Amino acid sequence: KSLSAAAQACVKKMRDAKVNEACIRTFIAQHVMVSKGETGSIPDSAIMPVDSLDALDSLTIECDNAVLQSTVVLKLNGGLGTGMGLCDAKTLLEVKDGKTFLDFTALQVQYLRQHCSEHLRFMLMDSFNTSASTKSFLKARYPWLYQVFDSEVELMQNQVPKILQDTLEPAAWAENPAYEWAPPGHGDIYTALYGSGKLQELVEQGYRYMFVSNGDNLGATIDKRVLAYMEKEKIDFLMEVCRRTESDKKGGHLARQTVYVKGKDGQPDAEKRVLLLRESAQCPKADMESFQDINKYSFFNTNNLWIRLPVLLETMQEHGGTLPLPVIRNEKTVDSSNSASPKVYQLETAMGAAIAMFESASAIVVPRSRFAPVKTCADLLALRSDAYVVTDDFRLVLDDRCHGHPPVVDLDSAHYKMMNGFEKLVQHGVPSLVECKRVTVKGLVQFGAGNVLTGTVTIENTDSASAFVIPDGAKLNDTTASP
C-alpha cells in the first residue's frame, strides 16, 4: 500500500467489519484528501452567483410512457424524526387519513404501474436504524414490494469510522463500539448503488433514468415534463432548485464556477460553466453574511435529482469504481453529547454535489410545492388538515380554497416541538384549516372535535400550569381565543 498507518488502520478496521470495498475505496480517498490539507471550505472568492436558469413552469410537453418503463424511483429513508422527538423511520409517520409518507409514494408507484408503466422500479435507501421497521411495514401493507425487498427494493447505507483530528486514526471508544462509526451523508447513494452491484444490474436491465428525493418530501413526485426536458436537451444530471426566501437564508445554495480550456495552437479558447453546492458547513465564518444574502445566491437544492444511470456508471468506472465528491469535514466529538471525548472528523458527502461531476449537468427552478418537507410538528398539522387533498394518482395538493398557499402554523416550541406534545393538541381531532390563512398556538391547548378555523386565528394560554380546552364544533373566525 501507499497509505499512511492511520489510513491503514482505517481500512483494516473496515475490512474486519465486512464493509464492502466500494465504501472503503471512497472513504480512503477522502481520508487521503484530508491528510493533504483539504478542509472542505468554499470561500466567496471561489464561486460566482448563478443568475439565469430554465423553469419547470415554462414547460408543457410530457414524455412517452416508454421512458417511464426505464425509470427508477429512489427515496431516501434513513431519517429518524429526532428533531420531533421520534425514534423510528420518519417515513412511517402518519401524515394524512391513516397513511404514511411511505404509503403515498408506494400508492403513487402502484398507480403508475397499472396505468402507465409496469416496469417502473421503486427503491428505498435505508439505514441500519430504519431497515427492520421498513421491512415489517411492507410485509403488512404492500406484499408485492415485500417479496422483492432484499433483492430489488432495499439499498443499504453503509457506515464509516470517525477519525481523530490529530492522527487521523480510527477513534476507539471503550464504553460503546457503536459511537465509533457514523453515516457518510446521502452522497453515499452512489457508493451504495455501485458497490452492491445494483447500478450495474439496473443499466443491464435497460433502466436509463433515476429520480431521487427525500422520503419525507411529499411534493417530490414523478413529473413527465422533466423526463422529456432531459431527453430533448440530452442532460445527464438535473437538480431541482427553488427560489430562496429569508426562511432559507441559513440553508445551502447553488453556485457557479467556470473552467477555461485553452485552445491548443491556433484555436478559440473554450468555456464551460460548472454548477456546485455550498452548504453552511462549507462556508467560512467570515463569509456567512454573503451566504445569507438571498439576492446574491437565490437558489437552493431541493434534493429532487434526476440522473441518467448509464452515464453515472461510466463516470464511476472511469474513477476506479467511485464518485469523488467534495468532502465535508465535520468537527465533532466521539461521544456527541460529551465534550470531554476526543475531537474527531466525521467525513460525509452530499448527493447534490454530484452536479459538478458531469459535463451535461443542469439545474431547473421548480415551484415550492415540489419541496414540501415535514420537519416540524407545525408542518404536520397543516398536512393533516383538509388544507391538503389527495388526488386520483395519490398525490397531495392544496385545496383550491387555499389560494395557492398552505395555512401558516406557528406552534409553541415549549409544548409542541415533540410529537407526544403535538398529539395531545389534536387528541380529539385536527381542525379544519382549509379556509385558514394563519393559526398560532401559545401555551397548553387542546382542540375539540369538528373545529373549523378561518382567517387568522391565535389561541394563547398564559398559565403554564393549566390546559385550555376548545369545545366540539367551535367556530373561530379572525380572533384571539383566550381563557
Ligand SMILES: CC(=O)OC[C@@]1(C)C=Cc2c(c(C)cc3c2[nH]c2cc(O)ccc23)O1
Ligand atoms: C419566492 C419566489 O420568488 O417565488 C418563487 C417560488 C418558486 C418560490 C417561492 C414560493 C413559491 C411558491 C409556489 C410557494 C411558496 C414560495 N415560498 C414560500 C414560502 C412559504 O413560507 C410558503 C409557501 C411558499 O414559488
